[PDB]
Amino acid sequence: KTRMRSTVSVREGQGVVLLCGPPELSYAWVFNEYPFVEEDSRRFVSQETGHLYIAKVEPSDVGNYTCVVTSTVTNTRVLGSPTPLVLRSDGVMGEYEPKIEVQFPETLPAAKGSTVRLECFALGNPVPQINWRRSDGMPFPNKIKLRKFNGMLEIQNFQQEDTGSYECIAENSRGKNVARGRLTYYA
Amino acid sequence: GDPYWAYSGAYGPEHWVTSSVSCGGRHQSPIDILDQYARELQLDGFDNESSNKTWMKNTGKTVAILLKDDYFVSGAGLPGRFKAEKVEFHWGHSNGSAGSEHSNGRRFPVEMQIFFYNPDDFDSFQTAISENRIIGAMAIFFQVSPRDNSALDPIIHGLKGVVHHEKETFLDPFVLRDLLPASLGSYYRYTGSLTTPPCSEIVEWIVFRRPVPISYHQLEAFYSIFTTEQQDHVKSVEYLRNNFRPQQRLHDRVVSKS
């Protein structure tokens, strides 16, 4: 589990992912020292991959990042060796289309009454804005809410009526890209 | 499982040999064709409009066009007829920057490659590769020009549709023939390899001497292409640019001319 993270040098305006490592666990990212990264439209932590997604690097992001993974079995947290990251001086990276870097599966079975959480986050400069919608044009029922600064869609009490194709749209001034996937039901 | 490689850094071209043994051999491509020391083709279906099922993909190393119509090339000293499989591109940095793989010495902003196999003794390109058998490849130079080239509209429009690594799209109808030089007459021939790992030394090349016009404007859709880099525990979004392999050494090789 223990390895020596080489310091990684990134560019201002560059879309970046900090991988955790391993894949029923919960993930968080601390900055510099213990304890957490301020998540917002620009930074997103996935409970599905464990990684930290920085859509556009700001100079403030320079520092040590380390991934704490907790085991649902217990309250045990196992830290990784931090990744320190700096800025290149050789040039700023320009604007570009959003690139959806983590997203819900093309097809996603869901137990009756369970709570499904669709993830969708995108690297982009300017910082992408996430929108959600159904493919068939039907508006969402009230029980569906936008968590994690629009990076997650939460469907509680999943029922057959909630099945169908869900789209995730990410855009900025330079274009838009789309993640699609059909949710299915089973009891 | 394929070896990680790139066009720069710890896994740039000069380090391919360490993971891909074939990259360190002789008869490697590209090379520098010398015209001073240099020295018929029949194209079937190139005159046809491509299918709406023919599609394009950003592979992170190039932009690939999976051809879904039947194109053939015969003659020019090839071991039989060859059927086209795919097209891939190589471009520079900006403002017409050299990005072509072959050259003499005069490099061009863009080089396009069309890859073939012989279907008389194989069923698919990917079988041919796995079996280390002979494949054909064309190399077509693009040179800057004052005016747009409408023959390339489907391709440029394609580029805009696959900006990011892994992105795919379908292409409007295009005519593969007009993706070739106005004059097919002057070209060269030699034995080489893939210009990417595994650098398999199994390729018969055709380098058309005359280039195809593109505008600076059309050129820009190539410089708008991104890729990713998986370094350590950090994945980053990067420009895909200067994606060409350094020219290799001829050794026991001679070029033909027609």
Question: For the domain that residue B51 is a member of, what is the CATH number?
Answer: 3.10.200.10
3-class SS of residue A112: coil
3-class SS of residue A85: strand
Instruction: Decide if B5 contacts B19 (C-beta within 8 A).
Output: yes
Task: Tell me the chain A residues in contact with residue B9 when contact means C-beta distances shorter than 8 Å.
Answer: none
Chain A nearest-CA distance from B235, in A, is: 5
Residue type, A179: A
Task: Tell me the chain B residues in contact with residue A99 when contact means C-beta distances shorter than 8 Å.
Answer: 163-165, 226, 237
Sorted by sequence, the CB contacts under 8 Å of residue A114 that are 6+ apart come out as A158
For B239, name the nearest residue in chain A, comparing CA atoms only.
A93
If you count DSSP H runs as helices and E runs as strands, how many of each does chain A have, helices first?
0, 16
Please judge whether A16 and B234 are an interchain contact, meaning their C-beta atoms are less than 8 angstroms apart: yes
Chain A nearest-CA distance from B146, in A, is: 27
Nearest to A96 among B163, B231, B233 (CB): B163
Q: What is the H or E stretch that residue A183 is in?
A: strand A175-186
3-class SS of residue B252: coil
Give me Rg for the CA atoms of chain B: 17
Joined tokens for residue A30: 């601390």
Asked if the domains at A1-92 and A93-187 fall in one CATH topology, the answer is: yes
A50 contact B CB<8A = no
Instruction: Decide if B201 contacts B27 (C-beta within 8 A).
Output: yes
Strand partners, B234: A18, B231
In chain A, which among 87-116 make CB contacts under 8 A with chain B? 93, 96-97, 99, 101
3-class SS of residue A139: coil
Please judge whether B236 and A97 are an interchain contact, meaning their C-beta atoms are less than 8 angstroms apart: no
Joined tokens for residue B33: 């064709």
* Distance (Å, whole) CA A64 – CA A2: 16
Please judge whether B232 and A99 are an interchain contact, meaning their C-beta atoms are less than 8 angstroms apart: no
* Distance (Å, whole) CA A131 – CA A108: 19
Joined tokens for residue A89: 């001086």
Residue with the two structure tokens 């320190």? A84
The CA-to-CA distance between both ends of chain A, in Å, stands at 38
Which own/partner contact pairs does A184-187 have at CB distance under 8 Å and 24+ positions apart? Answer: A184/A107, A184/A108, A184/A109, A184/A110, A185/A109, A185/A110, A185/A112, A185/A158, A185/A159, A185/A160, A186/A109, A186/A110, A186/A111, A186/A112, A187/A111, A187/A112
A8 contact B CB<8A = yes
Q: What is the H or E stretch that residue B161 is in?
A: helix B153-161
Please judge whether B234 and A85 are an interchain contact, meaning their C-beta atoms are less than 8 angstroms apart: yes
Question: How far is C-alpha B157 from the chain's CA centre?
Answer: 19
Sheet bearing A52-54, strands edge to edge: A43-45, A52-54, A16-18, B234-239, B226-231
Instruction: Decide if B219 contacts B98 (C-beta within 8 A).
Output: no
B71, with CB counted inside 10 A (0-12, 13-18, 19+), is: buried
3-class SS of residue A104: coil
Nearest to B236 among A10, A21, A175 (CB): A10
Q: Nearest Cα to A10, choosing from A44, A69, A60?
A: A60
Residue with the two structure tokens 């089973």? A186
Q: In b/e form, how buried is each residue of A149-183, taking b as 16+ CB within 10 angstroms?
A: ebbbbebeebeeebbeebebbbbbebbebebebeb
A85 contact B CB<8A = yes
Q: Are β-strands B203-214 and B135-144 bridged in parallel, bridged antiparallel, or unpaired?
A: parallel
Joined tokens for residue B136: 């054909």
Where do breaks (C to N over 2.5 Å) occur in chain A, by preceding residue number?
A: 23, 35
Q: What are phi and psi of B160, to 5 degrees?
A: -65, -25
User: Can you give the residue range of the structural domain that contains B146?
Assistant: 1-258
* Distance (Å, whole) CA B2 – CA B33: 31
Question: How far is C-alpha B79 from the chain's CA centre?
Answer: 21
The CA-to-CA distance between both ends of chain B, in Å, stands at 41
For B235, name the nearest residue in chain A, comparing CA atoms only.
A17
Q: Nearest Cα to B89, choosing from B2, B189, B190, B214?
A: B214
| Residues listed for chain A | 187
How many structural domains comprise chain B? 1
- Ranges of each domain in chain A: 1-92, 93-187
Strand partners, A44: A53
Sorted by sequence, the CB contacts under 8 Å of residue B123 that are 6+ apart come out as none
* Distance (Å, whole) CA A18 – CA A84: 11
* Distance (Å, whole) CA B31 – CA A74: 61
Instruction: Decide if A129 contacts A40 (C-beta within 8 A).
Output: no
B119 preceded by cis ω (within 30°)? no
Q: What are phi and psi of B153, to 5 degrees?
A: -55, -50
Residue type, B241: R
Joined tokens for residue B242: 């200067």
Name the CATH code of domain A93-187 (choices 3.30.530.20, 2.60.40.10, 1.10.40.30, 3.30.230.10): 2.60.40.10
Chain A nearest-CA distance from B183, in A, is: 38
A173 contact B CB<8A = no
Instruction: Decide if B162 contacts B225 (C-beta within 8 A).
Output: yes
| DSSP per-residue letters across A5-23 | ---EEE-TT--EEE--S--
* Distance (Å, whole) CA A30 – CA B4: 30
* Distance (Å, whole) CA A44 – CA A170: 14
Q: Nearest Cα to B166, choosing from B91, B62, B85?
A: B62
Sheet bearing A175-186, strands edge to edge: A107-111, A175-186, A164-172, A129-134
Q: Nearest Cα to A48, choosing from A143, A144, A121, A134?
A: A121
Task: Tell me the chain B residues in contact with residue A93 when contact means C-beta distances shorter than 8 Å.
Answer: 237, 239
* Distance (Å, whole) CA B177 – CA B69: 13
Nearest to A19 among B163, B164, B233 (CB): B233
Question: How far is C-alpha A59 from the chain's CA centre?
Answer: 21
* Distance (Å, whole) CA B95 – CA B13: 24
Joined tokens for residue A85: 């990251």
Joined tokens for residue B159: 């580029």
A126, with CB counted inside 10 A (0-12, 13-18, 19+), is: middle
Strand partners, B175: B49
Please state, as a whole number, how many other Cβ atoms lie within 10 Å of the Cβ of residue B120: 10
Where do breaks (C to N over 2.5 Å) occur in chain B, by preceding residue number?
A: 39, 103
Strand partners, B170: B55
* Distance (Å, whole) CA B35 – CA B256: 10
Joined tokens for residue A9: 């040098």
Q: Nearest Cα to A153, choosing from A105, A187, A110, A118?
A: A118
B81, with CB counted inside 10 A (0-12, 13-18, 19+), is: middle
Nearest to A6 among B165, B232, B239 (CB): B232
A123 contact B CB<8A = yes
* Distance (Å, whole) CA A139 – CA A136: 9
- Fold category of A1-92 in CATH: Immunoglobulin-like (2.60.40)
